[PDB]
Amino acid sequence: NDPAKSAAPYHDEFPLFRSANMASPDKLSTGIGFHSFRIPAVVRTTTGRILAFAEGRRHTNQDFGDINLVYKRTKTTANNGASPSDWEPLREVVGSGAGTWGNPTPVVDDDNTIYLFLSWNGATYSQNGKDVLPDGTVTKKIDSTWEGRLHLYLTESRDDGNTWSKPVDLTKELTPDGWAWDAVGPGNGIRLTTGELVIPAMGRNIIGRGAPGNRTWSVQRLSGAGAEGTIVQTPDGKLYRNDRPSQKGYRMVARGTLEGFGAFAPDAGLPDPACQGSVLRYNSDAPARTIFLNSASGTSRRAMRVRISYDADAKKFNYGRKLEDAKVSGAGHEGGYSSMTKTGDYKIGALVESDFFNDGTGKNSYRAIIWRRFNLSWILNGPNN
Ligand SMILES: CC(=O)N[C@H]1[C@H]([C@H](O)[C@H](O)CO)OC(C(=O)O)=C[C@@H]1O
Numbered sequence: 001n002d003p004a005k006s007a008a009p010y011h012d013e014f015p016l017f018r019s020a021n022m023a024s025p026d027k028l029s030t031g032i033g034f035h036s037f038r039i040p041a042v043v044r045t046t047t048g049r050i051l052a053f054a055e056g057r058r059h060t061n062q063d064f065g066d067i068n069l070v071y072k073r074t075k076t077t078a079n080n081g082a083s084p085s086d087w088e089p090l091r092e093v094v095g096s097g098a099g100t101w102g103n104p105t106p107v108v109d110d111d112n113t114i115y116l117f118l119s120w121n122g123a124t125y126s127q128n129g130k131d132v133l134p135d136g137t138v139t140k141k142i143d144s145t146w147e148g149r150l151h152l153y154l155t156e157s158r159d160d161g162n163t164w165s166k167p168v169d170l171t172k173e174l175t176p177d178g179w180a181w182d183a184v185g186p187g188n189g190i191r192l193t194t195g196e197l198v199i200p201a202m203g204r205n206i207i208g209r210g211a212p213g214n215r216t217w218s219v220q221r222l223s224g225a226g227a228e229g230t231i232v233q234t235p236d237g238k239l240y241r242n243d244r245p246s247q248k249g250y251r252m253v254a255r256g257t258l259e260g261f262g263a264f265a266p267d268a269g270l271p272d273p274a275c276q277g278s279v280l281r282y283n284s285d286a287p288a289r290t291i292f293l294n295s296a297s298g299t300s301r302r303a304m305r306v307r308i309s310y311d312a313d314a315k316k317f318n319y320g321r322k323l324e325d326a327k328v329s330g331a332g333h334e335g336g337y338s339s340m341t342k343t344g345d346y347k348i349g350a351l352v353e354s355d356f357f358n359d360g361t362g363k364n365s366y367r368a369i370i371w372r373r374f375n376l377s378w379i380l381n382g383p384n385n
């Protein structure tokens, strides 16, 4: 029932963000390097250029301390990132000593303005507090003070990702008062058939209305949403939140419109180990498809599975295909956060976290990011369907 299964299967994959332990580790032009890269996000722009974002975690793999927001672009608008030589060297969206810049959540607007929502916190604060920094300082716990809370920032590019504006703090506008912890995405926002932008965040969606690249933002509060959410517009044109659960088990899904959402409920078809996932609107003509990617396991992040739903409301996803069927060598053990885009040559492009595990669950375990391309035929020709 899917003509794509008859096309020749295609896959290729290679490390795109190379951690400090690897040959040719990724460093900025300034010489600044990174122990680990985590928290991927990818979008294809209106030109066809692909922009890949990540957190550059300077000294360890930990969520706190000196973390910068880094990126790579495809060298041209037409190369579709097919091989390592198609990608530019590492660049920086925003960096700094005193800050923790993370949670890249991009969305491409009609005018090709690429918006990138981001989180910021102080480099001396952490989620739990009392964590040890490289210099032996102990962090303070994230709190509701201006200095100590998670901020929500916005930067954009008007030149196809070549340069980025100094990020603007939108916390007072788009984060509820009295909040301490926060998250936006991470992964991506979307543009609706009806023209609005929707960016998933902790307990809310951020809605963009008005002129492309000159949007008015507002907050849609959600009941029972997760901290790390994904959003897609399903074939029926409705909205679909698919969120990381607070405890290991299953993805938490809710459906709605810009007028409001129904309740979140576990999707028993989508096991999840309490980790971020990604979702992608593929096409609208028969057969319409939504793509989903996470670790398909209640316990482990190393069960990465890409799936297709043919449902108008994405009610059920197929078994799909295990990413390990096309394993990458020399970049650690694949599994974790992910982000997906369509490419100009009819593939799906996916960024996927990978972990060398050289320090076990400890702070010195190097983390890299894999770039995969595969077509629908590759997914559909999986042996476990
Ligand atoms: C530090 C931060 O801003 N987000 C972190 C997030 C958070 O701790 C919470 O558990 C999610 O809801 O979890 C993870 C994780 O790999 O599990 C990575 C993120 O960097």
Ligand code: NA
Pocket (backbone or CB within 6 Å): 065, 066, 067, 068, 095, 096, 097, 098, 099, 100, 101
């Ligand atoms: Na930083």
